[PDB]
Structures are given as structure tokens and as C-alpha cells.
Ligand binder design. Structure first.
Ligand SMILES: [Zn+2]
Ligand SMILES: [Zn+2]
Lengths: 332, 199, 195, 332
């Protein structure tokens, strides 16, 4: 027994060579600010861990975003706070402005700088081809930066990308599931969102890395260019791998679980069957064809692979022809 | 046995009423103008004062009884504006006969009876808290049939004009809405009200 | 009959809604509550109608009631909880505002403190935006902490359409027709001060 | 049998020669003002007929006095309004500023200009001899003016004299009992206040005049200089005459009811007896002697006479030596 060990092709050892208290989040002492600085205006959204409100700072009066965190193990709270702070300042990363607490119930809240996003859904419906290229590039800037700082997001999806389309401003948000990369470490396969879960999570392969994020980024791209959301629409975690297998083919999947000697769930055996690798051109139709080019399809194909190690790194992705036209405009 | 006034004020629901002195009623001057407001004034007054009635008509006797109750009520409204009325009502207030303010931050301040209108028929009796200075509906439903006009719009205002020492301090504390510790900014309400208005 | 169904059915417990078993069975929702109730393990068992195994049975029953209460306070902040409480509000289960000018606006339960023991359940009127004591005495023993300081505020954050307009009218004190000048209360407070 | 008719020695026919609507108060149309101009501040006092509050005119922030009138025959209300208006402007007469009504219940209120009074206690007990002279003169100015305008006050007493001692300002207030003088008219003997009722009222002699006010002013002066209040302290209206008779003597009384052929009420039969006229010096003692002079006693004696016609008129009173020293200061 023993599944084959794996390691990230890039930034494998960034954490090894940093002082522990960069990655030792349990030991991070939180410096609390004054809650009465912030007063709530409206509810923005909510979710499995938090409730989110727009608010106003009364010191100087400008808007903020307050992510109020529901009871979890203090461990998880420190993890997010450390990562938010480690990455703060970095390109397209959300700026944590302050941390505050309800003295009584001691309910902790994160205060972020305001991001004025655009009907994101109602935005896509008319994103253009250049727009998808442009925004995809900006995600990659964040993804490369956070990977370079030794962190994997582990929950890349459209809800976690804020777009101020008016100001062509993007920000990779919600690091409540992000974690530090340590080579050799077995991680929790219960992360992401069932439509954005990489094959490695679906087969219970635990020694994953930054590449998980690139699979998710693939699932986003596929969704935007083909105009099908979500792209892999599984009914449960098992079915999710079937939906992927129906596109990528069951060949490369059994090759993948052999290459890494992964004990498959006996239940996967009984639903996967035998499927051919479908050509990406096959999902192209009249509604989407204006977003599909050969470079788009090549790029997507180099992102959505069972073998996490054969997926592009975020830096490599940025080098693809798909972004040539973007990088040129960004050469001002 | 007991007197008409004593009986009436003793009835269930009439807990807010005090007993008017016979002197006050027997003095015609105090009831000036009331004959133009109650049917069967002559006979109604006679009943109130426990005097010889005139009994063959079993429904006429109930019609007089209503008029007696209406007249008593209207007399009451005048009576409690006078020094002695106030004196009696003040006694009842110091016992809490009128109930207590439901506002949390009023801390059970004893209230006083008040009429929203002086015209009979228009509204039932309400309660006036002298701390928050607002007006409440009585909690118990037995008080939901006593006409407000039998107490009047000016009673509590007079009482504190006459005994200003009884006026309680304004509430030391106020309600502060917090969600997870955060206060709610007042912009949150325009916003909300729009969502109702837009709706 | 389910324990939850019984408890919410008791006289006094008219303000509680019935918490979904899904919500309780999901350990993640009850994070931290084991540090707040005695006999957590057994209390949770009772709430879920599970196999138990004297006065000890009563001690567990109290803890079950306390834990149910604290779960409730988290549950009604959630979309589904609000949905249920909203149903109860549309029926007027929580009573009505006693302020004459609020014209019987249906109210919502609120806690003045989130810590159990500190205060009993109070009622929030969304029209005058103030807080009242329940009229009926059966509700003077229900802990405020089992509803929480944030319930009504959240409800309107989620369903802003349900916020009533501010009262069209106000009380105006009149004596023999005359309004009372504000300097009458100032003098009246001065008199009371000297005694 | 039947009583001898009487007429005022002065201003007998001032009313005869004026347009009716000067004295025909029933036909006075009251012009109402806006009640919402006035807001109440504190209770000042009360009466059988009225409730009195200090108030503030919110249109220009001034203190006023609001006399709220309890249900009476409308006749009486018009009578007071007409008189207040006819006398408005005159010396030491209270200025009626406005009349208002509770639109709903229709309770009418008189609005007067603010008078800062000080209370019996601090005042009379503690006035000097000049003070009494000064203020008595000022009452006479009002009394002469209202008589000259053909009106008898009929309720002169200390509660109906406002004194702003600080500003040496005096006002003759409360005309709710004042009435127009018409020669030959039989008036109601139920006026004034027991202690200030003139003999004419106490014997049911109805054809009285302005002189009634002079009797009352006598009772006031006696009270102030002798330091005894009230001066004639009757237990009922019949006893009141006995108290007067014990001072002025029962002769001049039986002379008075003979002169006018007045039918004495059968319950005065055995009650009056026979009493000598007592010298005014008799009421002088150590507490009061600083207020008592010979001029004061002569003045009083010419005011308190059973025969209304032998009493000084208000103008004659002003000529008395008692005021020489005041009239002299009045003319620097
Ligand atoms: Zn109150
Ligand atoms: Zn209300």
C-alpha cells in the first residue's frame, strides 16, 4: 500500500525557508481594533461560515465590508487572518482593513476595504471575448502571487471573484479555505465547491498543491467561454467525477489513479464506465462561439487535466498565446 | 346596601374610575351643559344620586341606566381635573391602579388614564406614561370598552400642572440595537423603507 | 411526539419555532455550545429523541431545554429560521405593539442580552423600533438569550420588504385644547428635583 | 311699602348716551383667535369660574396669562369679554390680549398680557405706610376709570389686585362679575365675596351702583392698615352684617334701612341687637400703628358707610389728604 507521494512543480519550499510564524497561524496573536468604528448599512451576502454587510467607518466615513464570522474552531479563524495579512498588498488580493470583536458574545468580524462589484452574473451575460481574457489574466496574477507566497486558495469559483467592471478591477476574495503549502503534507479533500473540486479531491488523494486552484480556474474558464454554468454539474461528489469523465475520458482517469496508486472508492467503480475523450470543439455552439478561439481551447485543455502535475502553473498560464493580445495592451 | 357610584366604580372594567363626591354632583353648577349631552338627564342624575325612581317598563329602566353611566362618565371627566379629583386619582396612581408602562426602558413606570378625544364614542380609554410621555392601549381587554371621553384629553396634563413634583425623570437608558455586537447605522432604515416603498 | 414538537408546544413557549433535525444533526451548527451547557452529550440526545440509558433525568431535561434555546438563537438568524419566524409574525404569534400610534403593529421576539440568565424575552416593534415587555406573564420566564440581540435586525436585513412605514401620526398632549409648551416639562422636572 | 329708588352720584348716565353695543353685551360677536398660538407652561391659579395658566405665545415667544373659563351661560362670558374690551387701555386695568376656543369641545379662554404678581404673604404683611398709600391710589385710578366708563367691578378684593412690587405696577383683574350701570336697574345682590360685600347686598337692596366698589375698597384698606384680614370676618352673610354692625354701630344701620325703606329679611330679627359706633382708634395696636395715621382713619371712615350715597366717589377719594404726599411725588 501507500499512494505515490507528490510535490508542487513550483514554489515547493517557500514555507520551509520562512520564520514559522509566517505559516504557524495557531500562534498568531490577533490585534483587535475598535468595533464602534464601524456601523452597518446593508446586508451584502452570506454563506456557510459568515454573514456579510456593507458598513461605514465613522472616523472618516467611507464604506467598508464586514464579514461577520459564525462560530468555528478558533484555529480556522486564525488561519484566514494570517493568510489575509500575509497576502495583503499583493496584486488583486482583497485588502483586510481591520479585525474587530463583539465584547459580549465575542463574535469576531473581518473588515475589508470596499469592493464595488458589478452584477456578476448579470455581467457575464455580455462579457466579451477580450473581457474574459482580461479578467482571467487578473485572476492569474493573484493566483501566481498567492502561490508564490506559499498559499493555495482551495476555493476558486466565480462567487469568490469580485468584479468592478466599471473600473476594470478584480479581486480574489474569501480565503476561509486557503491553507499553507508544505511539501509532503496530506490535506483535507473536503474543500472547494462540488462543481469546482479537482479530481484529486474526488478520489481522496490528499497530497495535493497549488495545482488544485488551476483545475478550479479551468472550470471557471470553461463556464465563461461555453456559456454553461456550472460546467461540470454533478449531483453528488461521486457523480461529479462522472461528469468530468464524460468530457475528459475514462482513460486518462484510470491512468491517473494508477500513476499515483490511489485506492478508488468501490462505489466509483460502479458508475464511471467507459467514456471517450470528447473534443473541446464539441461544446461550441452559436451562443458561445464568439468567446471560443483555438487559443482558448488549448489553454483550457492544459488546465483541465486529471494529473495535477500536468496542469499549467499560474505563471505558465500567463505565458499562453490566449493572453498575448492582453499582455500587449498591458504594455503601455 | 352600596351606592350607585360605589357600585359603578366597583364593576369589572371600571378600575380606572374614582368615586365622585356627592357634593360635587349635587352642585348644579358643576354639571352645566351636561343636560345637552345625555338622553334622560333628569332621571339619569336621579339614579346616580340614589334617589327615588319614577317600574313597569323593563327596557326603559335599562335605557336610563345607560344614560346614568354616560352622565357619570362625563361628570368624572370634569371632576378629575379639579383639585379633589386629582387628589383621588393621585391616590390610585400611587397604588398603580392604572397599570404600568410596557416600554422596557421605562422600567414599569405607573401610568395614568387619558382620552384621545373628548367626544364620547370616538375612542376607548388609553394610558399615559409620564416617563416616556407617550400613550398606550391597556393590556387587559376589560378596559377596551371604557370610553376615553370619560377621562378626557387633559387629565394627566393637569395633574402634573398641579403636582409637578410627581413628574418622573426622563429614562436614564435607551434601547441600542446590535447585531453580533455591531450597532445598526441609520442609513440601514432609509434603505429598508425604500425596499418596502419600491415593492 | 417529537421532543422539539413538545417543547415548542408548551404554555409559554409560543415564541419558539420548531428547529429542523438536519440543522441540529449537523455538528458544525452546534460548534461551541458544548462549552455552554452541562450534560451536552445527553442533552443533545434528548432533543433528538434518541435512546437515553431520578433527579438526574430532570437535570438533563433542563440542559436539553437550555441547549434547545441556544440552538434556537443561532437557527433563527439563518434563512430557514427567519422563514419560519416570518410565518409566525404574519400570524401575530409574538403579540402586538401597545403604543397607541403604532396601531397594533405585530412585533418580533428579541433578547436584550445574548448571555443566558441576564434577562427575559422582550418584544421588538418594527414600526416604532422600540422594545416592550410581553403583556402575558407566561412569557416572563422565557430567557432572552434563546432569541438573541440580533434576530429582528437580521430579519429585516434579509427581508427588507417587511419593514412597515414609520407611524403616520404622533400623540399630541392637549389641555383644554392648548398644546403643552416644552418649557412646562423642564419646570416640572425642576420641581420634582427640589421635591 | 316698596324700597326708595337710588342713583349714583357720579357717571349716572354714561351708558344712556352710548351706542347700545357698548353695553348690550349679549349682542357682542366674539372674534376668535388661533388657539395654536398659545402653549401652557404652568398653572397659576384657579377659581369657581376659571382655571389659570401662564403660557407662551410661540409666534413671538412672549409670556401671557390664559384664563380658561369653565361652563357658564354664554351671557356671562360675553359680559366679561365686552367689559375687558371697553376698559382695555385704561389705567391699571388688565389688558385682554386675545380670545381663543377649543375647536372641538368649544371651551373658551381669555388671553391676557403677563403680569408678574407677588403673593399676599410677602406683600401686605410687609408693606410700608407709603406703599399702602401708593397702591391704594393706583386702585382708585382704575376704579375711577371703570366707573367713568359706566362699569362697576362688583368684586374688588385683594385676590383681584395684581402687584408687581418690583416694578411698582398694579393691575385690577378679574372682571367676571363686573356689570354695566344703568340708573334705576335692580341688580343681583349675590356678588363679591362675603367679607367684602357692602351692606346694600347684605340687606337685599338691589338698586346699587359704583359705590359698592368703594365699600369693598374700604374693607381692603382696613385690612391693610390694621393688619387684620379679612377685616369683617362673618361666618355667613347674615353674621357678616352683625360683624359690620359691631364696628359702625346699629344706629346708622337702622337709619339706613329707614332712609331707603328696605325690607329686612325676617332672619335678621333678633340677630343684630344694639351696638355702639366704635372709634377707629380702637383697632390700632403696636403691630399696625406705623400704618395708621389720622388721614388714614378719616379716609377709611368716609369709605365704610352704610349709606352708599355718603361714601366717597373714587375721584373724591383721590382728593383726600391721605394721598397728598403721593400726589406730590407723582408730580416731580
Ligand atoms: Zn413609558
Ligand atoms: Zn411600536
Amino acid at each position: 500500500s501507500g499512494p505515490v507521494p507528490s510535490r508542487a512543480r513550483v514554489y515547493t519550499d517557500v514555507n520551509t525557508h520562512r520564520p514559522r510564524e509566517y505559516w504557524d497561524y495557531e500562534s498568531h496573536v490577533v490585534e483587535w481594533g475598535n468595533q464602534d468604528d464601524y456601523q452597518l448599512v446593508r446586508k451584502l451576502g452570506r454563506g456557510k461560515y459568515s454573514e456579510v454587510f456593507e458598513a461605514i467607518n465613522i472616523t472618516n466615513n467611507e464604506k467598508v465590508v464586514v464579514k461577520i464570522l459564525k462560530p468555528v474552531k478558533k484555529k480556522k479563524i486564525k488561519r484566514e487572518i494570517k493568510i489575509l495579512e500575509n497576502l495583503r498588498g499583493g496584486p488583486n488580493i482583497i485588502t483586510l482593513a481591520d479585525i474587530v470583536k463583539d465584547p459580549v458574545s465575542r463574535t469576531p468580524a473581518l473588515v475589508f476595504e470596499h469592493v464595488n462589484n458589478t452584477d456578476e452574473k448579470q455581467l457575464y451575460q455580455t462579457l466579451t471575448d477580450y473581457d474574459i481574457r482580461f479578467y482571467m489574466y487578473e485572476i492569474l496574477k493573484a493566483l501566481d502571487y498567492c502561490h508564490s507566497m506559499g498559499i493555495m486558495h482551495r476555493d476558486v469559483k466565480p462567487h469568490n471573484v469580485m468584479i468592478d467592471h466599471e473600473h476594470r478591477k478584480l479581486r480574489l476574495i474569501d480565503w476561509g479555505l486557503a491553507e499553507f503549502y508544505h511539501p509532503g503534507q496530506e490535506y483535507n479533500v473536503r474543500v472547494a465547491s462540488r462543481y469546482f473540486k479537482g479530481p484529486e479531491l474526488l478520489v481522496d488523494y490528499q497530497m495535493y498543491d497549488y495545482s488544485l486552484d488551476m483545475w478550479s480556474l479551468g472550470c471557471m474558464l470553461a463556464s465563461m467561454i461555453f456559456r454553461k454554468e456550472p460546467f461540470f454539474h454533478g449531483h453528488d461528489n461521486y457523480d461529479q467525477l462522472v461528469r468530468i469523465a464524460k468530457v475528459l475520458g475514462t482513460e486518462d482517469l484510470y491512468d491517473y489513479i494508477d500513476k499515483y496508486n490511489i485506492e478508488l472508492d468501490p462505489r466509483f467503480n460502479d458508475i464511471l464506465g467507459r467514456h471517450s475523450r470528447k473534443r473541446w470543439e464539441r461544446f461550441v455552439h452559436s451562443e458561445n462561439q464568439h468567446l471560443v478561439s483555438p487559443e482558448a481551447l488549448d489553454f483550457l485543455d492544459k488546465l483541465l487535466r486529471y494529473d495535477h502535475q500536468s496542469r499549467l502553473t499560474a505563471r505558465e498560464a500567463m505565458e499562453h498565446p490566449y493572453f498575448y493580445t492582453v499582455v500587449k495592451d498591458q504594455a503601455r | 346596601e352600596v351606592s350607585w357610584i360605589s357600585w359603578f366604580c366597583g364593576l369589572r372594567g371600571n378600575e380606572f374610575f374614582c368615586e365622585v363626591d356627592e357634593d360635587y354632583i349635587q352642585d348644579k353648577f358643576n354639571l352645566t351643559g351636561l343636560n345637552e349631552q345625555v338622553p334622560h338627564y333628569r332621571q339619569a342624575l336621579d339614579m346616580i344620586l340614589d334617589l327615588e325612581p319614577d317600574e313597569d317598563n323593563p327596557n326603559q329602566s335599562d335605557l336610563i341606566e345607560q344614560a346614568a353611566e354616560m352622565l357619570y362618565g362625563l361628570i368624572h371627566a370634569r371632576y378629575i381635573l379639579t383639585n379633589r379629583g386629582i387628589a383621588q386619582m393621585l391616590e390610585k396612581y400611587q397604588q398603580g391602579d392604572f397599570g404600568y408602562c410596557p416600554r422596557v426602558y421605562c422600567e414599569n413606570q405607573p401610568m395614568l388614564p387619558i382620552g384621545l378625544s373628548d367626544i364620547p364614542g370616538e375612542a376607548m380609554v388609553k394610558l399615559y406614561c409620564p416617563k416616556c410621555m407617550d400613550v398606550y392601549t391597556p393590556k387587559s381587554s376589560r378596559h377596551h370598552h371604557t370610553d376615553g371621553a370619560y377621562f378626557g384629553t387633559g387629565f394627566p396634563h393637569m395633574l402634573f400642572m398641579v403636582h409637578p413634583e410627581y413628574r418622573p425623570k426622563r429614562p436614564a437608558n435607551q434601547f441600542v440595537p446590535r447585531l453580533y455586537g455591531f450597532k445598526i447605522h441609520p442609513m440601514a432604515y432609509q434603505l429598508q423603507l425604500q425596499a418596502a416603498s419600491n415593492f
